[PDB]
């Protein structure tokens, strides 16, 4: 059983490095955050359909993080430079540890086409995100391509997103924003990711079991 002290459910699921990780505990029963967590999204933004997720995750009886897409699998996109002083780890610029902020590599961001099949026998909660940069210079600095999209499909999901380029008030130094999404893959369903920029890719996901059944 995990009740969170310093962290929102969203921040903990994504791996906000400012939050206690409990590296010694690999499994849990259920998760519930408290009223005013000190840490939410170190890089500022919005977690979509958050109340439905919290409602679901309070009803779970088993919960276990697994790696589904290794960070080292990214060979033509930079998987190490996507960090920010907004997300410090031991003081150094870092990021949510359970996703990967993919960056262009050799001044190119080729189109990503990636699929993941939940061959486990439990439901799998999968998280991803999109980066909305502050201006066009940052858009091409990070992703090369000026005009980008993120396309996510399952058997029941068919989402296509375009980033908004807009300057926002600084939160933790950041005038950009990120938007995070989640879905539940049933056993043997697949998820498909396609993007030519601004994609915050899964690395880790969560096997979940709902009480009874």
């Amino acid at each position, epitope marked *: 059983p995990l009740i969170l002290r310093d962290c929102s459910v969203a921040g903990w699921l994504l791996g906000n490095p400012m939050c206690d990780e409990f590296i010694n505990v690999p499994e849990w029963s259920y998760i519930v955050e408290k009223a005013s967590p000190a840490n939410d999204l170190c890089y500022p933004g919005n977690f979509n359909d958050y109340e439905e997720l919290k409602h679901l995750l309070s009803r779970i009886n088993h919960f276990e993080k*697994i*790696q*589904i*897409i*290794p960070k*080292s*699998s990214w*060979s033509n996109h930079d998987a190490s430079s996507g960090v920010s002083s907004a997300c410090p780890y031991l003081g150094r610029s870092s990021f949510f540890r359970n996703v990967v902020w993919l960056i262009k590599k050799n001044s190119a961001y080729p*189109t990503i*086409k*990636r*699929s*993941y*099949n*939940n*061959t*486990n026998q439990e439901d799998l909660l999968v998280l991803w995100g999109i980066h909305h940069p502050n201006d066009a210079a940052e858009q091409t600095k990070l992703y090369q391509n000026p005009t980008t999209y993120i396309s996510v*499909g399952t*058997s029941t999901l068919n989402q296509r997103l375009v980033p908004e380029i807009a300057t926002r008030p600084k939160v933790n130094g950041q005038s950009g924003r990120m938007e995070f999404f989640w879905t539940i893959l049933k056993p043997n369903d*697949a998820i*498909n990711f396609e993007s030519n920029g601004n994609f915050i890719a899964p690395e880790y996901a969560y096997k979940i079991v709902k009480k009874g059944d």
Partner: antibody
Amino acid sequence: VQLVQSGAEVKETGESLNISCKVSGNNFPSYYISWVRQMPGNGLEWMGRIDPSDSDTNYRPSFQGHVTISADKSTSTAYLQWRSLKASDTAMYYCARRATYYYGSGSYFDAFDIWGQGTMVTVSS
Amino acid sequence: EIVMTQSPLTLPVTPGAPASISCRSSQSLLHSDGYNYLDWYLQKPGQSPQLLIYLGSHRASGVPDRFSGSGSGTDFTLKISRVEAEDVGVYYCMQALQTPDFGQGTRLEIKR
């Protein structure tokens, strides 16, 4: 999932030909379909591939120009097309699906896991 | 192009005995993700090619466990632990690091 190829054909040198490879199912997820040539008695030669969902197409440069590859998204059917056949186009043509996906706890699958039954092309008068 | 070289091109083996087919590439097939991008296919007489091994050493579903693949870099081996009658056909390795190139193919001969 099955790849269903169109029937065997005979055409004369200089005539047009279009052969098809249909991905059964909903084609989700959509994978690249490769075309492979086998000359009589010979080995396998990769010609090109296409993702039927967006028609992104890669050609082996040695085959490009003589043959074109296209796709129809709604039916998820790939095509190999000749404008003017030569006798050296007489061959068996296979299509193949390149399933590429992560699974389990971060394991990876990358292979031609499903193959069509082959389409025999005879170029003759 | 990556030149794929198979040896031998014709492989006679005693029924029930082990067999081994070597495949060498002109350039390393080890990718930065840690995998070797090398496949083995079997084409039985009159049939389409079928997948045996993928990513160098991973046996495809429904393939008898008598088949296995090994190697790394430029040196790869398909091993058949016990050669059965139903294994006759031509065996191909294929690099998938670039656009595919197949080896020439190895014909398996059963010395009944």
